[PDB]
Write a protein that binds this ligand. Structure first.
Ligand SMILES: Nc1ncnc2c1ncn2[C@@H]1O[C@H](CSCC[C@H](N)C(=O)O)[C@@H](O)[C@H]1O
Ligand SMILES: Nc1ncnc2c1ncn2[C@@H]1O[C@H](CSCC[C@H](N)C(=O)O)[C@@H](O)[C@H]1O
Lengths: 387, 387
């Protein structure tokens, strides 16, 4: 139809006219429009069939199809893709036809296949690891959730050792300890840490304003990245503020600190093994940074993590929580869906700004500023001080 | 934003101006636009989180939340819904917040919850049964598909007894025989048959033209509904052509024929137990009707079903296959996703128009006409004759 072509042309022009945050708003609008115009039959057909995307993406990941296709300079038929990757010709054909229908690849007028924007994404190892994480970990969790809540007469999940994860994987350990005994899952989790989300808090964080007259002399610590993974926040800090004095310390576990040495700058950033369930060793640091850490623990354990940092704070010291702050109403699917997943696997929760201040007050902390850096799904850096 | 409000209003006006087929075109365009304007990070987030909808819908079905909410004349807070349904107040709150974000319910400005169009859909027993089927029968099979194809070095699946279904449920039976030994699954499958798809082939089927000078005298059968479920095709046939003489026979298994007696007309439609893997008993009938039947069997078993009907055909007899006919290129997700699901659970396949004629030629049949009645996803009634 000419009308649907006019809609595509029109919405494309509007998307290119705004920024990434305007585009995120448009995508949520297209999603609500789809859900509001589907017939009752289409609704069930949509929920049933969108499950296939994760499973089919995993199949393509196991075959290296997205990586191989991202390096092809010419359209490929189904037969050669099946032969080069070692797959049955008929099986490959049906997979590609499905992928093309959900834009996982692109199909040409002569029934050949090229890469789409989703194909390039699935070839990036950090993002491909996120999709495999969804298939092999959270899917099973999610699938055990409804029968788990029925047997327990629908309780409020508040314990990391009593949630759907235990029934899903037939163990009594929590998700963190159980992961260490699984080598292939640890390997994938390591690749997953190499993906750097963008933008980061430094795009709106007024460092100099929050710094004040704090002095790095003699050799105080400027930035302590507690559970910092590959140290992306540390790296982006030295890049944006290379002249700012003060130590920049990446704290994590020895396994991931060893992996981070490959991509760390030769100087500027210290690697320091630390378990944040234990007292913080660095004293009087300006910023203690927690990005996507406290959302993986229930309120009683997230408080313990904060209670181990408080004894090491000066009056100039600030605890910075970089995490999602969903609104009290009108929350988007990207911040309510994660809330259900971490509840089922970790017994934790997403927290509104109010739930953050209530958790922080129990540690003796007080909110000083809140600097959002994503829209419409809110990721903010919350600056906390003593008193 | 004012911009996203203008898009919603504009597409709503265009949606109400066209028919159901035009709206299906618009929804598919909105989906392609969503997939093409999402950041690489959003793509992974979408596949991860859209999985929750099936799990969350199953939870709401287990609580009767969608049925209860569809009967409320005033907005309900999370606390009152939790108490009436026997659910934890905090657990209910997070569930409603997630449902609201995916339009599974609607949230009000004062944080209360009412029904949406999806809520009414999930309250219809036939559609709720379709969602429960996806959770308990489809989802597991899919979860087992990628590891199944890896162990077998990615073969072409052509056998109903050697697919992901066997690994998913740790049995050696095919899906049909294993289903009979499961009481709760049989009950849900029975409710699933009560949902009537719309429109049906009678919206474009030229009965009088295809009927010709066929005489019902002495007592020939006009319509034989082979595997007809609740007999919806039979009922809509007596309704649209009530004066057309001839017997209208609904054929299925004793379990579902007995369940269909509740909604069958008092007269007009005969119920006849029959197993379509056995020779057809009704002789010289005008139309032998197969709706969504041959889609569930591989080529070797689907042919036997046709080979059992051929011996009962006159020269005037016609076999009518009502099924999906996806195009050779550009197939929509609704007809490629089902192809992957029936491959994984039943070892069968969706068939293009030529693949249908190739299957019918092996039975001695010849395509006479093809009457589409859905767009853009093609469901057609294909009229076959002998020779
Ligand atoms: N007990 C513990 N002590 C210290 N670090 C831990 C820990 N348990 C988990 N972690 C670390 O916490 C990290 C969470 S992933 C978050 C990484 C970083 N905050 C970012 O967003 O870029 C993982 O890298 C993991 O190694
Ligand atoms: N071996 C068999 N013999 C006869 N009917 C069978 C059968 N195996 C399955 N069926 C029936 O075939 C139907 C498939 S779903 C049927 C939907 C219906 N024919 C429609 O037009 O929409 C079920 O009702 C099931 O009971």
């Amino acid at each position: 139809m000419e009308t649907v072509a006019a809609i595509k042309t029109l919405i494309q022009q509007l998307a290119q006219s705004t920024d990434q945050f305007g585009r995120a708003e448009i995508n949520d609008a297209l999603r609500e429009l789809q859900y509001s115009l589907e017939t009752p039959f289409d609704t069930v057909m949509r929920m049933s069939l969108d499950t296939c995307q994760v499973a089919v993406a995993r199949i393509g990941s196991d075959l290296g199809l997205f990586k191989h296709l991202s390096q092809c300079a010419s359209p490929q038929s189904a037969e050669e893709l099946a032969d080069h990757l070692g797959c049955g010709r008929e099986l490959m054909s049906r997979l590609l036809r499905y992928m093309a229908s959900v834009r996982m690849v692109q199909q040409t007028d002569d029934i050949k296949y090229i890469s789409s924007n989703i194909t390039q994404t699935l070839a990036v190892p950090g993002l491909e690891a996120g999709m495999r994480h969804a298939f092999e970990n959270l899917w099973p969790v999610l699938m055990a959730l409804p029968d788990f809540l029925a047997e327990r007469k629908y309780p409020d999940i508040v314990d990391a050792k009593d949630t759907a994860f235990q029934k899903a994987f037939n163990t009594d350990q929590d998700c963190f300890h159980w992961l260490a005994t699984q080598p292939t899952r640890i390997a994938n989790f390591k690749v997953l840490l190499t993906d750097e989300r963008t933008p980061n808090f430094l795009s709106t964080f007024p460092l100099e304003k929050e710094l004040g007259s704090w002095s790095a002399e003699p050799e105080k610590a400027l930035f302590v990245d507690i559970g910092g993974g590959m140290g992306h926040a540390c790296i982006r800090l030295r890049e944006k503020y290379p002249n700012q004095p003060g130590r920049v310390i990446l704290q994590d576990l020895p396994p991931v600190l060893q992996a981070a040495q490959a991509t760390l700058p030769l100087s500027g950033i210290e690697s320091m093994p630390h378990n944040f369930h234990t007292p913080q060793p660095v004293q009087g640091a300006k910023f203690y940074f927690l990005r996507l850490i406290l959302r993986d623990f229930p309120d009683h354990q997230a408080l313990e993590i904060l209670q181990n940092i408080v004894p090491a704070m000066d009056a100039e010291s600030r605890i910075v929580i970089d995490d999602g702050v969903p609104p009290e109403k009108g929350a988007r699917w990207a911040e309510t869906g994660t809330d259900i997943c971490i509840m089922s696997a970790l017994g934790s929760k997403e927290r509104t700004q109010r739930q953050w201040e209530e958790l922080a007050a129990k540690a003796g902390l007080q909110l000083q500023a809140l600097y959002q850096y994503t829209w419409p799904v809110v990721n903010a850096a919350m600056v906390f001080s003593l008193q």
